[PDB]
Amino acid sequence: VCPQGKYIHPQDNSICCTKCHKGTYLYNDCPGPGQDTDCRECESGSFTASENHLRHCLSCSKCRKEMGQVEISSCTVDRDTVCGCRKNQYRHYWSENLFQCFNCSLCLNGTVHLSCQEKQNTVCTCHAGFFLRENECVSSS
Amino acid sequence: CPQGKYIHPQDNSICCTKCHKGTYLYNDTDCRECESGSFTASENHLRHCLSCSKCRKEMGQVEISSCTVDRDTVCGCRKNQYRHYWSENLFQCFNCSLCLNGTVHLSCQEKQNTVCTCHAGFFLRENECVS
Amino acid sequence: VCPQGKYIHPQDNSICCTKCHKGTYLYNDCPGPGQDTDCRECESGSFTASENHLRHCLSCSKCRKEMGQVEISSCTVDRDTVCGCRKNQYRHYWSENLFQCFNCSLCLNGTVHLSCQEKQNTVCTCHAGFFLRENECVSS
Amino acid sequence: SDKPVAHVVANHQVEEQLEWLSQRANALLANGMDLKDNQLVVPADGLYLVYSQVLFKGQGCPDYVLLTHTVSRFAISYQEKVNLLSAVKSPCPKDTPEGAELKPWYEPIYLGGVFQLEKGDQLSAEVNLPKYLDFAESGQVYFGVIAL
Amino acid sequence: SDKPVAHVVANHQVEEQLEWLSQRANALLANGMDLKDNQLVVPADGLYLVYSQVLFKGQGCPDYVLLTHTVSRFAISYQEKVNLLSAVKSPCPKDTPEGAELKPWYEPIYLGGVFQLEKGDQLSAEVNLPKYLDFAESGQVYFGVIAL
Amino acid sequence: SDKPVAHVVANHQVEEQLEWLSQRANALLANGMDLKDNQLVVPADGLYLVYSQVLFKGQGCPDYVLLTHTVSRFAISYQEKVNLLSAVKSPCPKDTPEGAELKPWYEPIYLGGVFQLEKGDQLSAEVNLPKYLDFAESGQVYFGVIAL
Ligand SMILES: CC(=O)N[C@@H]1[C@@H](O)[C@H](O)[C@@H](CO)O[C@H]1O
Ligand SMILES: CC(=O)N[C@@H]1[C@@H](O)[C@H](O)[C@@H](CO)O[C@H]1O
Ligand SMILES: CC(=O)N[C@@H]1[C@@H](O)[C@H](O)[C@@H](CO)O[C@H]1O
Ligand SMILES: CC(=O)N[C@@H]1[C@@H](O)[C@H](O)[C@@H](CO)O[C@H]1O
Ligand SMILES: CC(=O)N[C@@H]1[C@@H](O)[C@H](O)[C@@H](CO)O[C@H]1O
């Protein structure tokens, strides 16, 4: 039990150390009780996005060109690269972190029941004469 | 040590009776029953039970016997299919050949396809009779 | 600092040991100063191609039949297997060591500007109406 | 013998989830390693070899699909989930044509490295799509951490 | 230095069998590890890192084929062959059409984990179809056991 | 803790080259391991676990391509570059037909073994075509050496 915002010194249960702010990393723990923590700024191409006592900054991610991604924000010292998709595309998340940019459906011979969203394709419905098969309107006849 | 016993790990003097299949060595004999989803199929002095195997639906397999505490799951194929062993343990269920344009020389078996011969005009390729 | 051709005995900074000649390997270091190094001949299917103090011979490589390669020289005790391509083929190096044998281009609808070489395809030019893609002359 | 150690394996009985087990032959959880909420928890500061294998399988390729496998660290020193080891697989480049045979495919992935970890750090080994995991036989899916 | 250790590699000279060798550069068999009947035999109770790699290759896809790679334990405590590590590969989903180019394919598989083993336990590293193994170059096929 | 250790990762910022880094979270270069001219240099005679992973990626298959990954030893005792560990991958058997979708593909490769190395030996981890490497996320490309 150290207070909020502080951590127990790895080599001494007696000492509580103040955490580093996002944008920085732990260069060195407090040398002793009451002493300052030595936090230094993340070098280019790395970052930390939360308060921490981590010995090095995290490597920035890179937009996936193979997924059709585009960069919204480059890596800063306290924020990872942010990636997304273009006009009239949505993100399909294959996993927590991996996503692929696809084109929004136009719901031809149908109607846009729910518009394309950031992370979700257009939901189509069909009207009389057609029916829906894999989000496209096919002729009943 | 005699048959059915083993040398105690921490004392060369002592011989210990092995655990019966269906059980495992809790302690050097203290044998306990295998928990659900595990088994032992031979006498042993093993610290935990083995994980049961599961039928391969992707190979078209079907379960003949579920895992019991002393017997692993047993899997096979359906009517009119045979097992092709890709390896010692992996097998795939295929449909028996019908020997069209030919003749069933030897009927399909558990681990062996139908043996065909072919009528005049044809020969065997992929165990089907082709022109 | 041992002289050229010699090496520091692993367990004694005082002693310099003569290196093994290519074709051999280190069975054992000098037992002491001024003593011989025990180098033995590489067994069949292995080799060493430079002077060394290596505890075993390297495994010979094998020609890649899947790449269409053919053997020029079998493995000897001091030279690794050497592989190449057939008549009218060139080597495309996918890497420092991996290469694939391809057929030389004939520059159809075009002209052989520079003939096929060992490691380089024919250089074509194309007749009017065509241009190069995948070093074949295709319609424009 | 004294070194913290884990080599855990997948529960064959639960489908569509990757649940780790230790109480099986040729599995390990000893000398301080803990398995809590499906995560391996390091008992002591030190260097650990961390590794995991998964085997994915499917029946033909009705759809394009991407499979991921990731070993993550949730560190006391940095309270976010962070990739230690990660990979991706693409088993189904072209869809199986309508009517053609749905031939089984298999995709193993191995991940492994040495990491400085801290007492209390949580390691997890995960895939995006557990429905595709192959639990047919032993030794196909596992997750290990050993103190060096 | 004192720890039992093996890192063995495939015989390039025998085709259609996977025979392990130790007497080559960057291979190891020392401090009690034994290689008998193509199996690695553990000299002492303890934790061992166990691993193997194989590289399979082929020239186009005339046929569907499944390739397996398995590291097994034959334990003194349990006299049956049991998978420690296992995987499967499916290089040829569709057959190469008649007349089309037979393009080379390659499939590596890595297996690796830490296991408690006992003096006299026999470990084997095997594939179902050695005809497909790639022996062209060093470092493509290997099998290792090291005492931690 | 005292054992020489490296777990280095790829520079995301240089494209078309595989340049290794140590000064990042969950990366290591300690206790005598040196990183010089993109090669890991062993400080002491001994047994080391050596390993590397790469992830390759592409957008469809306009062309046939072979991808290689190799860990090499440049030994004081034998002054040539020699394969310790090696593998090959063939992501694009058939070309994507003209007009069809260029679907992303991914190919991981893992290499790993134990080797007796000598003080001053240089280890390198390389691919033939760095343009295809996947630097999107952490844990996808790495190279490690640890003294056992
Ligand atoms: C079938 C019908 O009644 N109307 C049109 C048809 O002319 C068009 O070619 C096709 C495109 O999806 O389907 C409908 O839009
Ligand atoms: C040629 C003949 O006498 N009979 C038929 C032929 O028309 C058919 O397409 C072929 C397929 O393999 O099987 C034969 O039995
Ligand atoms: C290769 C193949 O298509 N096999 C078929 C399967 O698709 C079908 O549903 C059923 C018919 O008996 O079993 C097999 O004959
Ligand atoms: C890719 C390709 O067409 N390769 C051909 C082979 O099929 C042919 O039989 C022979 C010609 O001599 O060798 C190669 O040129
Ligand atoms: C899968 C697919 O065909 N995607 C299309 C691409 O071919 C087209 O040229 C362009 C138009 O915006 O981008 C996508 O809509």
Residue numbers in the entry:
A (entry chain E): 14 to 154
B (entry chain D): 15 to 42, 50 to 152
C (entry chain F): 14 to 153
D (entry chain B), E (entry chain C), F (entry chain A): 10 to 157
Any passages from the paper?
There are currently five approved TNF biologics that work by completely blocking the interaction of TNF with its receptors but to date, there are no small molecule therapeutics available that disrupt the high-affinity TNF–TNFR interaction.
In order to further understand the impact of our compounds on receptor binding, we have crystallised mTNF with and without compound (UCB-4433) in complex with a truncated form of hTNFR1 (residues 41–184). All attempts to crystallise the complex made with a more complete receptor (residues 41–201) failed as did attempts to crystallise a complex of human TNF with humanTNFR1 regardless of the receptor length. In order to highlight the degree of distortion of the, arbitrarily defined, A–C receptor binding site, the UCB-4433 bound mTNF–hTNFR1 structure was compared with the complex without compound by aligning them through monomer C. There were no structural clashes within the long-form receptor dimer and only a minor clash between receptor and TNF suggesting that such a complex could form with only very minor changes in the receptor. In the overlay, the CRD4s within the receptor dimers were well separated (highlighted in red at the bottom of each dimer pair), suggesting that a significant conformational change would be needed if they were to form any kind of direct contact, so it is probable that the long-form receptor dimer present in signalling networks has an alternative conformation to that shown.
